[PDB]
Symmetry: C5
Subunit: 242 residues, 5 copies
Amino acid sequence: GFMIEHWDFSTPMATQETTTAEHIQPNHWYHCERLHPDIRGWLEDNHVPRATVDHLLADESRPSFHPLDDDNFMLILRGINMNENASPEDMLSIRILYFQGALISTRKIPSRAIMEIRQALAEHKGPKSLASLLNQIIEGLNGKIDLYLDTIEETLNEFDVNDESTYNHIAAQKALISIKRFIRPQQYAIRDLIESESELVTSRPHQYRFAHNNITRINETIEFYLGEVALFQDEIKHNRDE
Amino acid sequence: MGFMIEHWDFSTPMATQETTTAEHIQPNHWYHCERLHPDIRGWLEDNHVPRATVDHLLADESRPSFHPLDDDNFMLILRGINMNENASPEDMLSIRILYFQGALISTRKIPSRAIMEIRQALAEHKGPKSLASLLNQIIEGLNGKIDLYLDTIEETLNEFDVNDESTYNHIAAQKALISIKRFIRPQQYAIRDLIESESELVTSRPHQYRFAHNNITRINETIEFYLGEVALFQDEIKHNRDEK
Amino acid sequence: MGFMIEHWDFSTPMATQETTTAEHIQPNHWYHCERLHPDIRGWLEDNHVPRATVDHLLADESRPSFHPLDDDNFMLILRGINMNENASPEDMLSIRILYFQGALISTRKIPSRAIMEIRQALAEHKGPKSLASLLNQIIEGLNGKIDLYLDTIEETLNEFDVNDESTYNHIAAQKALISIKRFIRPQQYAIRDLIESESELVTSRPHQYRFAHNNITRINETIEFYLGEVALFQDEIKHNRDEK
Amino acid sequence: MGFMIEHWDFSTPMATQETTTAEHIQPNHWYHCERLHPDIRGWLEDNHVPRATVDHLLADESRPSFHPLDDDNFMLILRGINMNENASPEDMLSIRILYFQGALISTRKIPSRAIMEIRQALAEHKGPKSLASLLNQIIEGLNGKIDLYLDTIEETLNEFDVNDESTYNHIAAQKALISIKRFIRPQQYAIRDLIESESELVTSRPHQYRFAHNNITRINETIEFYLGEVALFQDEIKHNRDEK
Amino acid sequence: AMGFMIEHWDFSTPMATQETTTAEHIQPNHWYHCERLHPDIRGWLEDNHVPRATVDHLLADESRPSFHPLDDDNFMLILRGINMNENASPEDMLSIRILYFQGALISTRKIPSRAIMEIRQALAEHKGPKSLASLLNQIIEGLNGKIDLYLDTIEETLNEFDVNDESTYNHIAAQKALISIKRFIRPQQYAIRDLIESESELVTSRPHQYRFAHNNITRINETIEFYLGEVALFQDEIKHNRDEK
Ligand SMILES: [Cl-]
Ligand SMILES: [Cl-]
Ligand SMILES: [Cl-]
Ligand SMILES: [Cl-]
Ligand SMILES: [Cl-]
Ligand SMILES: [Cl-]
Ligand SMILES: [Cl-]
Ligand SMILES: [Cl-]
Ligand SMILES: [Cl-]
Ligand SMILES: [Cl-]
Ligand SMILES: [Cl-]
Ligand SMILES: [Cl-]
Ligand SMILES: [Cl-]
Ligand SMILES: [Cl-]
Ligand SMILES: [Cl-]
Ligand SMILES: [Cl-]
Ligand SMILES: [Cl-]
Ligand SMILES: [Cl-]
Ligand SMILES: [Cl-]
Ligand SMILES: [Cl-]
Ligand SMILES: [Cl-]
Ligand SMILES: [Cl-]
Ligand SMILES: [Cl-]
Ligand SMILES: [Cl-]
Ligand SMILES: [Cl-]
């Protein structure tokens, strides 16, 4: 079935619920397979408008925040692809709907950050509410981007002009532009979410601001790394003349 | 053909096809027209469209843009991929649309596949159910065709191999990308402005027009990424030449 | 007083040509003048144009700009293509205009083709019907000549052929485009600012001024595209030379 | 309790040194702490600093930033050049500051020469006379040290001579400059955001904080200029090597 | 020769009068032109109750063009001009730091500005500004005027670029000059904007004149960007010419 997980956040101790749930209920989280044949009917049966279902399930996407009817919204985010035999910069997309007090998330390429949240819920130490769950999805994705950026930084710190074996600047640059494509929009999506004054944000104002600070830092770090690559390229030009 | 290509009536929930010899503009009708036909100005002016707005609508040169006019009226100009036999897809066609006294009037020089697909949907009685939806579909249809074309560019970039000279189609790619960008950036701003006007067409379908705007933004960011990829390959070639 | 080139009375919709020895400035009149004539300062100051505003109007150096002055008065400065025989077209002319006590006073040094066409139309009883329309026609006339010149640049660009050194005119085209960009970018903000001022000369024709603003924006976008084309052809030459 | 480096009381304008084992935070006190010490979290949390705030204060990665918190509370994060023995200057230190319940709590890992100088002043009974002044001195202190370091880069850049290959220290200068730029830009915004919050610590010294902000703005512009000079020298070298 | 105060003028009346250069109490409608590096200036400013930190900023080693609204109607305005003194380059621009304080204009210099000399000469001939509002306007426009004159010398260099004549290749020198100018002239534009938006009595009495001065500095900035664009193109000209032939 399309429903990977279902949790009830009616109390601070989330309880696991049937993956055969027919109706969307307030305070519940549904984590779903985006490409499964049955998800469209389930969403539409539950009165999610056709056009918003279409955007949520579309092949193409960018990180973005979309205010919808009365407290509802869509939030789309990207994460690093940590799956085996995958290109990490071929970033996964998580598409989230906050609809009638429920959080519905959709995935295709599995997210390590989301697996950690799921594992925490199973061990009875997960988020205490939907507001906190969304916060942890945002920060978990940030965290995994930071880890990937550390591997780029290692490659960059290896750049030695007198050593041609360390000339990996083209690969790093390719990785960095691929990430920048989505991580820049990610920053604006989190900004827009906050400015929306969603009950999920206004209950955790300082925490969402910290999340926004981290995504901003990530973007500034990418810019710096791109500058380092450019500098190394000129250092190679300068070494070829001496 | 006179100037009028096709005429649809949305004053019933199921749109009906009407005569192309309609002489008067009626609310909730869509008139699809040849911009370069000699008779179009006369028809527009006779139906009380001001001469100066007709002049902008029929101008040789244009850019995608939104123009609020009197009352609920507006002009919206957009570009699309050129899928016609003697042209290049990147020499994008201009579609100039007037929303006037409750009617939609679209004008073309060269046919648009987006608009053709809408006309086929209406003929099969499964097209847009209103002018609001119709304009929404025109915008999203143009996006979709731009996406399709961009996929073709992506394939070219994906075959870039520095070790293989025959794959060095990076200059062609860049030419195409910058030709698209020329118009697709103002397209984003036109759609933003349309939304911000609070047009009755938009406010009936607010989330859907927001989604269309998200898609044009994505397209622009995709073009920027591809232009980055092209610049990267050009460095990869240059840095290979000094070793090679 | 030899500084006055031509004087028109727009008090009626059929403008009449008047004497060039006009002491007092009258509302709804247009005075077209030689900026560098020794008698022009004295005429302006005697008609109560403040000295510092005469200083700016007549200054040696200028940029396209809009200046709200007091009491419905303003100064507008614009640039045009130099179409004079044996001139360099990118040696652009500057037209400096005062809207002052309900009169339009324009000043020239390098003659403008757009203004000559307006004067010719007036001589034939088909010129603008008001000062509001006249100013709009000066702006759009200048836009139009810029478009014409840009078309010649485009021709040059379409003839780029990497395998034909007789076509390697990219340095000259780049030179022309940056020289025009210098003034054409401020021109767009000048027109934006004119519209924002809510001048009676603009509020009478809101849609028309937004079209003029759209044309100047287009020109700027076209210039950026052409520069991108030049930059690409430079890269093309560098790739071709290193590959052959 | 070994996390606390120093503790001062600013209740009076003569600040007094207090015990390094103060379990409860008091208004008008300054606590300067080791960020990496395992006991800091517990002390902050026992004093009712929310866990997520502590999480951000103590995180591995940071950028300069201002965070408005509850009820006059805030977090400010700033960077400083690294003046520790044998360190890279551009391996910049991060100072993370909480203003919480009327107390200033600063946290360090890499020691700040600026903060050491403020501490020496307090030990010599000539330090800042309030928490408002202390925060101002921390900001301006960090700035001052950056200015001093940048003067060394300026010397290096002025000694550059294209005919003397021993003066080619511009790429090392460039490495330093981009690394500093990375954080110095966010620093300017953090200080702007601090001022815009209308914090009691700022509104008591409004002109002083404006001057501090002008200084960081100047630092940014100077770095941009030095980066421009470096680029210029590189082109100078390219142009000097390709003449042979 | 020996003192901090260079000149003192009284603009109480439309015909300014030269007054004593003795370190006294400042008066509304007076202009005090001073040596910024003289040991005595800080004491005078503080004796006259200018706050310590404002004095620190005014007399600081480093500066950028900027506008600083202070208490009441007071402000600080910092500007840069061409350095037309010997053993300096024109592009090593001088900082002129100006305080409007209790209705007096206090300007400070390190090295002479030709713009301010010309105003001082006009005052001496009884043909100078008739008010502090006009004085400050003339300082701003005077500084613009001299930057324009220098930019003309750069234009001369540029117009003489000829790709087939290596003796004309002074584009490295020109670009260095331009980025050095741009460093300060960009902030100067914003400082003048900021001064205008403050609604200072010195600005509101001459609203169109100060806008013309703002238009002039904006024009200067655009001209600089254009010349920088011409230097980049001449670099492309050379590069093409070199490996084509
Ligand atoms: Cl996405
Ligand atoms: Cl995915
Ligand atoms: Cl997942
Ligand atoms: Cl993840
Ligand atoms: Cl943001
Ligand atoms: Cl168009
Ligand atoms: Cl077309
Ligand atoms: Cl069509
Ligand atoms: Cl299409
Ligand atoms: Cl937009
Ligand atoms: Cl001009
Ligand atoms: Cl002229
Ligand atoms: Cl003329
Ligand atoms: Cl013309
Ligand atoms: Cl604009
Ligand atoms: Cl930091
Ligand atoms: Cl640190
Ligand atoms: Cl420290
Ligand atoms: Cl420090
Ligand atoms: Cl700022
Ligand atoms: Cl300065
Ligand atoms: Cl100085
Ligand atoms: Cl002086
Ligand atoms: Cl000067
Ligand atoms: Cl400005």
